[PDB]
């Protein structure tokens, strides 16, 4: 089911997993909004190219 990282399970590894997960979530939000800004500027630039 799904996939796993084949790491030995311990509560220290669990702590690393939750901190990595929250880091991944904050990176997802950060790069998603960065891409939103970049695509806004990119639409501006591409209509500029068109005209």
């Amino acid at each position: 089911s799904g996939n796993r990282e084949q790491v030995f399970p311990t509560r220290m590894t669990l702590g690393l997993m939750k901190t990595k997960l929250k880091g991944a979530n904050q990176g997802y939000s950060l790069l998603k909004r960065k891409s939103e800004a970049l695509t806004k500027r990119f639409r501006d630039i591409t209509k500029r190219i068109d005209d």
């Binding site: 950060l30 960065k34 800004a37």
Partner: protein, 475 residues
């Protein structure tokens, strides 16, 4: 009439020099007559040292006593134990305000033993579901971080979540010294028969911090309204368990018999949970999740539900339990159950504390589940809820714009984000930042929030209705 004449009856309290053995903090008695569940004892060491204890288990001629402050030096040939009448009962009286008590209820100031009006059972009673009412007022804590936003209703059970090194004790002391009803401010100093009292309980509190509490409340007018309790870390831990029970019994007596408005503050619920763990493991009991006893939910429910307004009686109990996160995690049993039982919470943030801001209440993750009832026209001021919502929205926008500062650069932000960064700086530096001895009344807090929210033009204040903007923006 007062049917207290039964107190003159004298009952034979027995003395047993029949200790069979000692096992940890427990002593076991073989021959005790006619067993009933729980009592209180005063056993004497062979060297004459008088020690107190409780009763734990009961079967056919089976009695086990859990001695306070350990069982060092207890032998089976000289120690004697005296069985008092019944379980622990606090001597409670109206003039208990202004007194400082140990975890066992014995006063620790230079005053005498409290002149009891009645001995009240410590556990309490189950309030009938047919006789409860909603909390429908506001308790002003003087802290603008808790008044304008995260307002505490008159009967709301709202905790304060903090960590080990953070100054939750200082915030508790400030709340206790500054708490009061908004009504005297609202009623133009006409309302004074609505007396307000505070019951402060300190559990596992450190000796220096306990000294700080005692000295600070003594050196201010808070003590006259405060009945105070301390329990040191090196003190017996079942006394730490008794302390919140004593505090809530006193608060319940005051509010629901003297018709007072009582604010109850419990400090370091984590120490209380540790004491629960120790006592639960004292008997041969299987540990639960994270070692804590499996019934901690029920015990915290019993402690917390001793709050709120009730049918008939004009008093109220407002509870502010304060606990420390063992690992800064919500998932820990103590904060989890406290959030599951109480209404909302207040967050004291580690990073906000390191950044040199006091009091460091983190507004974003903190909510008051009953803030609507504390807000109104006669209740506090009319603009209170809208100003709170606008402040929360602007603070969130400032926060995520500050997060984006390092990704898109300052120049890539909109005027929304420029004004939001300015608002966040001024906010966390002047509004949330409040002097430890500074008492902002709720209207002063709202005025500061308006002068700080006046940064934006009326167009940009979306969360506030125009009916309020046409009234309060221009001053």
């Amino acid at each position: 009439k007062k049917a207290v004449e039964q107190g003159f009856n004298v009952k034979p309290r027995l003395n047993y020099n029949t200790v069979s053995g000692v096992n940890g903090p427990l002593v076991i008695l073989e021959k005790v007559k006619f067993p009933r569940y729980n009592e209180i004892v005063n056993l004497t060491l062979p060297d004459g040292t008088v020690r107190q204890g409780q009763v734990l288990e009961i079967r056919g001629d089976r009695a086990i006593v859990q001695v306070f402050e350990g069982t060092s030096g207890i032998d089976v040939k000289k120690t004697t134990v005296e069985f008092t009448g019944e379980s622990l009962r606090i001597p409670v009286s109206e003039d208990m305000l202004g007194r400082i008590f140990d975890g066992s209820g014995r006063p620790i100031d230079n005053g005498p033993k409290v002149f009891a009006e009645d001995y009240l059972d410590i556990n309490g009673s189950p309030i009938n579901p047919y006789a409860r009412i909603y909390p429908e007022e506001m308790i002003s804590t003087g802290v603008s971080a808790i008044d304008t936003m995260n307002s505490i209703a008159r009967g709301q059970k709202i905790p304060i979540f903090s960590a080990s090194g953070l100054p939750h004790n200082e915030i508790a002391a400030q709340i206790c010294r500054q708490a009061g009803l908004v009504r005297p401010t609202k009623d133009v100093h006409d309302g004074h028969e609505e007396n307000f009292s505070i019951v402060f309980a300190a559990m596992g509190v450190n000796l220096e911090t306990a000294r700080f509490f005692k000295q600070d409340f003594e050196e201010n007018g808070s003590l006259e309204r405060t009945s105070l309790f301390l329990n040191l870390a090196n003190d017996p831990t079942i006394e730490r368990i008794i302390t919140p029970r004593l505090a809530l019994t006193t608060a319940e007596y005051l509010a629901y018999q003297t018709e007072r408005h009582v604010l109850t503050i419990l400090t370091d619920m984590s120490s209380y949970a540790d004491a629960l763990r120790e006592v639960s493991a004292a008997r041969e009991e299987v540990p639960g999740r994270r070692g804590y006893p499996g019934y901690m939910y029920t015990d915290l429910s019993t402690i917390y539900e001793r709050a709120g307004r009730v049918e008939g009686r004009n008093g109220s109990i407002t509870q502010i339990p304060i606990l420390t996160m063992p690992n800064d995690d919500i998932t820990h049993p103590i904060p989890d159950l406290t959030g599951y039982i109480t209404e909302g919470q207040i967050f004291v943030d580690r990073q906000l504390h390191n950044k040199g801001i006091y009091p460091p209440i983190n507004v974003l993750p903190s909510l008051s589940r009953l803030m609507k009832s504390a807000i109104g026209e006669g209740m506090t001021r009319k603009d209170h809820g809208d100003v709170s919502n606008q402040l929360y929205a602007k603070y969130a926008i400032g926060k995520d714009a500050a997060a984006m500062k390092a990704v898109v650069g300052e120049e890539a932000l909109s005027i929304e984000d420029k004004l939001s960064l300015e608002f966040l700086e001024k906010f966390e530096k002047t509004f949330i930042t409040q002097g430890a001895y500074e008492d902002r009344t709720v209207f002063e807090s709202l005025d500061q929030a308006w002068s700080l929210l006046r940064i934006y033009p009326k167009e940009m204040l979306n969360r506030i209705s125009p009916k309020i903007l046409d009234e309060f923006y221009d001053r």
